[PDB]
């Protein structure tokens, strides 16, 4: 409580560069685990179509696969437009 206060004061008086560096590194380590937009970053990465989407051979038992891109089925990037 007071020991850490005196140590931090001495460090800020003598080595401000090291204090700033350690603070920045600690924030960089800690903050990503508490952010709600990391999931958004992952989903943005998954949403980029680098390669061709190969169609599946219809067998009559896929209610959740579209037969046309404009069909309502499949993933939607409506969330991405407002983000």
């Amino acid at each position: 409580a007071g020991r850490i206060a005196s140590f931090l004061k001495n460090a800020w008086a003598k080595e401000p560069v090291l204090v700033a560096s350690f603070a920045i590194g600690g924030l960089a380590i800690i903050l990503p685990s508490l952010s709600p937009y990391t999931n958004y970053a992952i989903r943005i990465n998954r949403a980029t179509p680098y390669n061709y989407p190969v169609p599946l051979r219809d067998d009559g038992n896929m209610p959740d696969v579209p037969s046309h891109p404009q069909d309502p089925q499949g993933p939607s990037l409506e969330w991405l437009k407002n983000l």
Binding site: G25, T38, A41, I42, N45, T48
Partner: protein
């Protein structure tokens, strides 16, 4: 193909400048003019004698720290992977180990030049 032409052009221009500088003016070379310079006097020893390096340990550490650059340069492309958590963990771990190496050499007086 274009870069080869550019490199050839630049080297050719520099070499032509050297050739002009060495063949255009009048040259009068004698032993006193071409002697080594030590501000008024003949050097006592040779310039090929050993010259001590007081920062040799930092020079060696530079070799190891130069490969962290190789390991860290593909980070912009690595940031595009789907499993961002693993990539971020590995990048932060690598930088943490680099910082720990720097701290270890700093605290063991490895950054101080030899006396």
């Amino acid at each position: 193909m274009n870069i080869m032409l550019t490199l050839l052009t630049n080297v050719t221009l520099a070499s032509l400048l050297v050739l002009i500088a060495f063949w255009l003016p009048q040259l009068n070379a004698y032993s006193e003019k071409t002697s080594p310079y030590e501000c008024g006097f003949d050097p006592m020893g040779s310039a090929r004698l050993p010259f001590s390096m007081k920062f040799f340990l930092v020079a060696i550490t530079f070799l190891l720290f130069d490969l962290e650059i190789a390991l860290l340069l593909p980070l912009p492309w690595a940031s595009q992977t789907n499993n961002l958590k693993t990539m971020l963990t590995m990048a932060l771990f690598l930088l943490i180990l680099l910082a720990a190496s720097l701290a270890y050499e700093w605290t063991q007086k490895g950054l101080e030049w030899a006396e």
